Design a protein around this ligand. Structure first.
Ligand SMILES: *[C@@H]1O[C@H](CO)[C@@H](O[C@@H]2O[C@H](CO)[C@@H](O[C@@H]3O[C@H](CO[C@H]4O[C@H](CO)[C@@H](O)[C@H](O[C@H]5O[C@H](CO)[C@@H](O)[C@H](O)[C@@H]5O[C@H]5O[C@H](CO)[C@@H](O)[C@H](O)[C@@H]5O)[C@@H]4O)[C@@H](O)[C@H](O)[C@@H]3O)[C@H](O)[C@H]2NC(C)=O)[C@H](O)[C@H]1NC(C)=O
Ligand SMILES: Cc1nnn(Cc2cc(Cl)ccc2/C=C/C(=O)N2CCN(Cc3ccc(F)cc3)C[C@H]2C)n1
Ligand SMILES: *[C@@H]1O[C@H](CO)[C@@H](O)[C@H](O)[C@H]1NC(C)=O
Ligand SMILES: *[C@@H]1O[C@H](CO)[C@@H](O)[C@H](O)[C@H]1NC(C)=O
Ligand SMILES: [Cl-]
Ligand SMILES: [Cl-]
Ligand code: NA
Ligand code: NA
Ligand code: NA
Ligand code: NA
Ligand SMILES: [Zn+2]
Ligand SMILES: [Zn+2]
Length: 783
């Protein structure tokens, strides 16, 4: 029970959230039906609007939404344009950009406050409109630090992305995996409407306001109800900034439901989009004018950030499951720009997922969605390790929708939620203030990295998250994080020739300085876990061979622009040779591959790229072979025989690092021995879930990859090791029509491979460690 007979006089939007029986006056009191009786009258006043006019200058009526009185500067409740209209001051946007070398804060401000100004559905390309439509935002962008775009997380929806911005976590870790979700342990559904979202049980990880409070830094509200106009949200933030030193927060958030609302109705390029964009710019202007009025415009760090973009999507572009499935009444579909399927009744014995996927696979030539069991989704989405993510997922093609049946002019022209590499899904990032760099453009980056930066801007230690601390140090003038190189746990063994050909009963038949200088360009990768492994040198490649997995953890080799591709001679087709540096007890065997009728093998260093016939014999060593399904070999052989040479010709040589990945529990992390669920028949040779490659070259392509003096250029992938090519609808055609498209879909960051393998790359370069961390977060999108 709450005593609603109390008053909100002198308490409007207070930060101390009182509990029952005291009535509330904070911004969230309406959601819990606990506001005091006069909260709407005293705190949500709108009389005379939000702007001072000439006739209003010089007195005071408490009924006014904001004031134009001489005492309003002391009270901290002027309308944001008061100084401009009444005291001959200029608007912030009309003032020239002046570098902020150090924080210029009034007395009592120990650190520069942070204001996060978040905009829903603000597509990156909206920034190209410029100062014609958005001058305040253009001033922040050109004067501060900006990226051409920021990558959101998948699904590219509001709730997963705002919570990722707050925690630095992937949605699978923070638990907000969609705007709608069913949790089978709670036996409950979370939805935008409804009370379920208010229960803390859904919200995992540690959001910024909690990180701040636990470390003694105060926070303003990060949740604004729709019954509070934007002008009042700005005035409330300004009011809080005027509080006494022991009460004033250091971190604030502003949220706008626009341009997302108008984007859904009119499309991202509808002429109707101009007005909501100008209204967001005027809100930014009100904030900067109010900060200038407070002498805080050269003190506060401001982040202008979006959650996701917006794409043209209409009713006319909808695929229906009833066209592929006999029974859509027995399944529940979370629909739209993604699909998540589960039986209507949990654990229904008649649910046949194998038969459902089969019916949704390559059934139409222009099929505008692709089904996946969640562990088969591209690893860069990081969208599998949560009980709220249904096993069956549909990746929807951009501009399309998926629905259960036709019943479910269009009422909408825009939507979002698609794969986070889609261009229309990219959003904005601008940092402005004393701690951000001046007039600096930075490369595009992922929104999971912002939590570390916001913690840096506030002097906070971030809770464990998925950002790479130090990868965004180039955005900041000061408060950079001093990253520390991860300690190598296992030191390599360097075995010499110790065995004879006669020591092996495997059922098989058939210049270290120069190797390191040519094929290991950035030093040996560090093994960050306890294991036994051997460095093996060869003329054409170097490898880190695992005694536990019986295969390389990594294989490193350089292919120059003028390297020649050769064929495997007919007499060497089935050649596998024992390695006299590795014990028969620590080797794979050919008998297990012959016994396993579904599993064949491939090589990490390709025999096709040997530098000479004599050197080609090393490519056939048992220590260079890895288990591969014949369907996968079509992909791997095309990559090794055609694509590597193509990349070497285009990038002026390439350094390739390839190897296996074991991620049976789809958690994005290296499996321990116990978690590996498949082995080559009758053996202890584990079967990889994926195969990776990291392809590095010189950013200045006029210098060969093996003689590069400056920054590096990287592209990587994590290919699913699957027994069929069902993901590629055109895989009956020659590999030149489908393999590269499959690889582009499975593009990856080097950081994604490090998590999945327990290895640490680029340990020996002439580049700063912060630059290397940025290179490790790079994702080549092919957009
Ligand atoms: C992205 O970054 C995150 C954060 O660093 C990494 O996630 C962490 O992974 C490690 C290793 O697997 C986990 O450690 C284990 O933790 C448990 C104890 O876990 C409890 O306590 C911690 C600490 O307070 C808490 O964070 C945990 O929170 C999880 O569970 C909550 C209840 O279900 C849930 O509300 C919350 O969202 C979160 O769920 C996620 O994690 C669990 C696994 O912990 C997972 O099953 C679920 O599906 C979600 O993904 C929890 O209350 C110890 O008993 C173990 O011994 C071990 O220490 C961390 O718990 C985990 N932290 C988070 C926040 O997820 C990711 O690996 C990294 N991803 C990549 C790809 O690098
Ligand atoms: C979702 C998510 N995750 N974190 N946030 C916080 C947030 C974080 C950052 Cl980095 C920047 C800005 C914001 C602010 C967001 C915001 O004001 N709204 C309006 C209210 N609704 C509804 C609501 C949900 C749960 C509740 F308990 C109460 C209400 C959520 C959101 C759209 N939102
Ligand atoms: C509680 O509410 C009643 C009116 O419903 C009021 O008379 C009472 O004084 C309030 N409590 C306090 C402690 O003032
Ligand atoms: C799959 O489609 C066929 C028609 O091609 C239909 O006979 C069958 O019932 C469908 N199966 C499921 C599980 O929907
Ligand atoms: Cl919450
Ligand atoms: Cl196929
Ligand atoms: Na994700
Ligand atoms: Na402060
Ligand atoms: Na070496
Ligand atoms: Na794993
Ligand atoms: Zn949104
Ligand atoms: Zn939306």
């Amino acid at each position: 029970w709450t005593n609603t007979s109390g008053s909100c006089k002198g308490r409007c939007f207070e930060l101390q959230e009182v509990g029952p029986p005291d009535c509330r006056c904070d911004n969230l009191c309406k959601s819990y039906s606990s506001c005091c009786h006069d909260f709407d009258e005293l705190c949500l006043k709108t009389a005379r609007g939000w702007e001072c006019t000439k006739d209003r200058c010089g007195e005071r009526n408490e009924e006014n939404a904001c004031h134009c009185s001489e005492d309003c500067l002391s009270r901290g409740d002027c309308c944001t344009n008061y100084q401009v209209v009444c005291k001959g001051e200029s608007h912030w946007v009309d003032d020239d950009c002046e570098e902020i070398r150090v924080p210029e804060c009034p007395a009592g401000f120990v650190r520069p406050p942070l204001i996060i100004f978040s905009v829903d559905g603000f597509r990156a390309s909206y920034m190209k409109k410029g100062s014609k439509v958005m001058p305040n935002i253009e001033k922040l962008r050109s004067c501060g630090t900006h990226a051409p775009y920021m990558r959101p997380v998948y699904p590219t929806k509001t709730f997963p992305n705002l919570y990722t911005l707050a925690t630095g976590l992937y949605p699978e870790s923070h638990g907000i995996v969609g705007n709608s979700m069913y949790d089978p342990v709670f036996d409950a559904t979370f939805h935008l409407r409804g009370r379920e979202k208010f229960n803390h049980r859904w919200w995992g990880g540690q959001p910024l306001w909690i990180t701040a409070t636990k470390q003694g830094v105060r926070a303003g509200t990060f949740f604004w109800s729709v019954s509070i106009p934007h002008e009042r949200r700005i005035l409330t933030i300004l009011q809080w900034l005027s509080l006494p030193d022991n009460e004033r927060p250091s971190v604030y958030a502003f949220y706008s439901e626009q341009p997302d609302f108008s984007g859904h109705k009119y499309g991202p390029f509808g002429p109707e989009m101009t007005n909501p964009l100008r209204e967001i710019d005027k809100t930014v202007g009100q904030l900067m004018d109010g900060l200038k009025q407070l002498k805080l415009h050269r003190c506060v760090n401001v982040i202008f950030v979006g959650d996701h973009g917006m794409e043209d999507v209409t009713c006319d572009r909808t695929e229906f499951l009833s066209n592929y499935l006999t029974n859509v009444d027995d399944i529940t579909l979370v629909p739209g720009t993604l699909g998540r399927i589960r039986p209507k009744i949990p654990n229904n014995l008649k649910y046949d997922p194998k038969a459902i996927i089969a019916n949704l696979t390559c059934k139409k030539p222009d099929q505008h969605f692709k089904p996946y069991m969640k562990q088969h989704l591209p690893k860069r989405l990081h969208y599998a390790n949560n009980r709220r993510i249904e096993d069956l997922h549909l990746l929807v093609e951009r501009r399309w929708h998926v629905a259960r049946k036709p019943l479910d002019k269009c009422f909408f022209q825009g939507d979002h939620g698609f794969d986070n590499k889609v261009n229309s899904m990219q959003t904005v990032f601008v940092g402005y203030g004393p701690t951000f760099k001046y007039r600096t453009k930075v490369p595009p980056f992922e929104n999971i990295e912002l939590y570390n930066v916001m913690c840096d801007l506030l002097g906070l230690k971030p809770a464990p998250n998925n950002g790479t601390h130090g990868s965004l140090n180039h955005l900041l003038r000061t408060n950079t994080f001093r990253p520390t190189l991860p300690e190598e746990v296992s030191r390599p063994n360097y075995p010499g020739i110790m065995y004879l050909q006669s020591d092996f009963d495997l059922g098989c038949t058939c210049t270290k300085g120069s190797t390191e200088e040519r094929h290991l360009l950035y030093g040996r990768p560090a093994v960050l876990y306890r294991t036994s492994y051997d460095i093996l040198y060869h003329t054409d490649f170097e490898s880190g061979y695992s005694e536990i997995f019986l295969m390389p953890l990594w294989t490193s080799y350089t292919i120059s622009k003028q390297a020649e591709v050769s064929s495997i001679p007919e007499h060497l087709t089935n050649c596998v040779r024992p390695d006299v540096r590795v014990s028969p007890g620590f080797s794979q065997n050919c008998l297990a591959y012959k016994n396993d009728k579904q599993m064949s093998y491939g090589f990490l260093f390709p025999p096709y790229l040997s530098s000479s016939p004599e050197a080609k014999y090393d490519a056939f060593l048992v220590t260079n072979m890895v288990p591969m399904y014949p369907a996968f070999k079509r992909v791997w052989t095309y990559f090794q025989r055609v694509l590597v040479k193509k990349y070497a010709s285009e990038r002026n040589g390439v350094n390739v690092i390839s190897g296996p990945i074991f991620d049976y529990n789809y958690n994005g992390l290296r499996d321990i021995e116990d978690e590996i669920k498949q082995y080559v028949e009758g053996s202890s040779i584990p079967v990889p879930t994926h195969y990776y490659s990291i392809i590095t070259s010189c950013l200045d392509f006029t210098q060969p990859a093996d003689k590069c003096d400056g920054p590096l250029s990287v592209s990587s992938f994590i290919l699913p090791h699957r027994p069929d090519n069902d993901e590629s609808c055109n895989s009956s055609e020659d590999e030149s029509k489908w393999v590269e498209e499959l690889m582009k879909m499975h593009t990856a960051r080097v950081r994604d491979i490090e998590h999945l393998t327990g290895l640490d790359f680029y340990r020996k370069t002439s580049r700063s460690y912060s630059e290397i961390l940025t290179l490790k977060t790079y994702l080549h999108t092919y957009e």
